[PDB]
Design a protein around this ligand. Sequence first.
Ligand SMILES: Cc1c(C#N)cc(C(F)F)cc1Oc1c(C(F)(F)C(F)F)ncn(Cc2cc(F)c[nH]c2=O)c1=O
Lengths: 539, 404
Amino acid sequence: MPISPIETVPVKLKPGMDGPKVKQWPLTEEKIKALVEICTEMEKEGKISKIGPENPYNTPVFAIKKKDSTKWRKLVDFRELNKRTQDFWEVQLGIPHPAGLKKKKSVTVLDVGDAYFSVPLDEDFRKYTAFTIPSINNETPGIRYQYNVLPQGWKGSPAIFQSSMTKILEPFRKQNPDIVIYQYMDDLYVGSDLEIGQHRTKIEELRQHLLRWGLTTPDKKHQKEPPFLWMGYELHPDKWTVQPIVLPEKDSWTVNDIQKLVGKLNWASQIYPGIKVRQLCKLLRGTKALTEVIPLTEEAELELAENREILKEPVHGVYYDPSKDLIAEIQKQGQGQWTYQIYQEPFKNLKTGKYARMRGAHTNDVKQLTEAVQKITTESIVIWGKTPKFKLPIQKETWETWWTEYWQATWIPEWEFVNTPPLVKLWYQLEKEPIVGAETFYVDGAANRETKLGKAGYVTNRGRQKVVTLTDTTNQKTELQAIYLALQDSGLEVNIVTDSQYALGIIQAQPDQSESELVNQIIEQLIKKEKVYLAWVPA
Amino acid sequence: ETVPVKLKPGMDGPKVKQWPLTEEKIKALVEICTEMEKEGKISKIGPENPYNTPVFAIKKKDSTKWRKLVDFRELNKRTQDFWEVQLGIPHPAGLKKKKSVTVLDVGDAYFSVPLDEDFRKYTAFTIPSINNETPGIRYQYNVLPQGWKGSPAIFQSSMTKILEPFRKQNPDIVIYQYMDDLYVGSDLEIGQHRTKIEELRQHLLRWGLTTGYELHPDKWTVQPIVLPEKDSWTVNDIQKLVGKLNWASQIYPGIKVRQLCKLLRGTKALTEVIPLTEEAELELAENREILKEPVHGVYYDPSKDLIAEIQKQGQGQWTYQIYQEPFKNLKTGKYARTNDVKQLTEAVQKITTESIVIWGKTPKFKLPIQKETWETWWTEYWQATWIPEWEFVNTPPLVKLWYQ
Ligand SMILES: Cc1c(C#N)cc(C(F)F)cc1Oc1c(C(F)(F)C(F)F)ncn(Cc2cc(F)c[nH]c2=O)c1=O
């Protein structure tokens, strides 16, 4: 009902563009009747105003009544106006996370009633919101209106509403520093550590300040009670959790059923520790239609069963205490899966999460662990404005050996070793110098670009030699095949000389996981050797 | 009174994401911005401003106070015609030839000059909110901002008037303005040089300018490609020597490797000792005299961007090359130490500072780090008021070996 006496936000069209001039399609008599009734009510309430014939703009209107109801809705198609309207600043950078909330004695939800219709539209822009209710069979001139408030479906409404609420709340915020107010869409979530009586007094004073600016909110009888159900979460007085999750039991799983399941598992993973989705995600790889049935592999069945067990008993997170440190612990789950928990007091988790190994990468657990530390660090700065102290399953010596030899600059903030197997380690190490009394293999690999045929082989200082033929190969594959040949045919100590910077760079980084069968084959050989020296020579 | 600023046609103002900031940096920024808004330097803005430029908080070189650092890299690229073509500050060739170069921050000079009303919208920045409690605190500039290349370009006439008596009284001192700093070079004895710096600080002080730091560009001698001096030479040693010489054959004209290639005749054991011939030893000595001299045929092309590559050599050592065309080096050097990210930010600042002194422009860096690792931490150790362009590379296994 009220329209805020707040100052308007000046709005422009995109440079070089004029307002929309989209023709109104003739409508049925029942649709015209409904629109006239709706519009007469909005004009009465100050939301829209009748315009003269002068205005050359037009945006189409439609009337929709759902068959279960006898209520008509006015629908305005602002697609053309939105395309011609200036860009606005983004509404929010992120979304509030429950783990980042501090515990409050009392918390109140105040949702603004008819939010957009309570905020005025820039007087110079109103003319572009012009719409026409057509006459019966478009016989005579239609009834023309323009908006005076923020229209539903218009590009600028969310940002202009938000900045209006910010400008309004500003004095109340300055005068009440101990009251927490979260702004989200049409809502205000207000918390305090006052005794219940003065919290209700402060809430009435806030609602009264907002009413002074045209914003209506619910009173004591109508305002929500905990637990608050918000954006897939449950907010209880001293704990939070994700809303109920039911994992369906189907005879046949479709691509759509599996996508829905993976989304629910990912959503539960922010508070249920150990949730895994690798095997279920592998099933979604490919060119498969939404309703196509994908049989579960034994591995996806194993993973689905493990998830059901985790989710069988409800799990909650605690709220944040800004006067304490955040501790993040990470565990290796196998096959590139990593799980983590963040707590302040052991072991009452604020939240949990997971990290997965990058696809098609030659990599090791030290690199995956560094990536997981980085992901957690960034997420922590977003939620709490600080980095946690880490507890990692890697020895200080293993990390020290890694970072001192790696070509890339790498670092982990404050951390301590925690003995939680499986531990993170490097599975082989290249020699620093050529091995004496070890056989030197001068390996070679080449592939013809036209026939795609390759040859991979070696010549040794001891007289040994081999050449093997390969089909539908590349230079890269033949130079990895040549290194693999020397590994297969050598003793426990071997000096290998290659012309490949490609192969050298992969092996030098001590990978132990690869999507390439050939790299994995080389890894198996490297682990088994006692001493391997690898050198590069120009062609 | 204000100088009208136009963007490059076809390009719009910056719309860069604000990177997450810690609570202490946010509190530092809210305090600085509250004070600048009281003074009218900046103003709160509405949502009808769709522009954004990232903002950070760093520790000053002179104190333990927080300072605002705005990343205007995108706005600078989008106004390159104004600050470079329209109002270019010429680069003096004599600056790198000076015994001492002192770097003075003069960024406080710009707060006295109002910004063109129609350009203010492009200087929008946001102070983020922890856990998205509130929408970001949005502001735009009302005066010439620090970090924007149009600022010294506009202040140029005022700076000339400020420096006129000092320059007239000290004709052999070179003063060069780059972004928010003055580079003051002289051939005076260090104590006489410092006295002139303090005298120049008094001149700036009369115009409200209350005042890296001490460089010696004449003592800058490039790190050559180093060939080892050995008593005995294994097969492996000669192969590494050939690889390193093959690399400098593409750079330096006249490098020879025929006689040393002849020594690797066959498929010998890597550990096997090979005696050096008279011819290969002469060839080795001739290559050493070429490597110790500057590269013949390599010249700075002002129409091309400078590129800087850095390699981590272990034990707190880092090497670097500055070039425009790959491997046609304009400068080579080394940096010595702190954690890896701290050492790397320090190397980037040292290399950019030398680049500003030699060419009057910053290089685009190829950083040997993970994008996310660098992006999270670089701000903890940054002390400069400028920021260079950077990208992330996977240092080739032998580019490191050729520059060890
Ligand atoms: C109501 C609400 C909702 C909803 N619906 C959604 C969000 C979302 F932003 F996280 C926040 C939000 O408001 C809360 C805030 C607050 F900070 F925002 C402000 F109220 F103090 N701070 C903490 N909690 C948890 C909590 C619940 C309770 F029953 C009693 N005591 C408590 O501490 C909130 O629920």
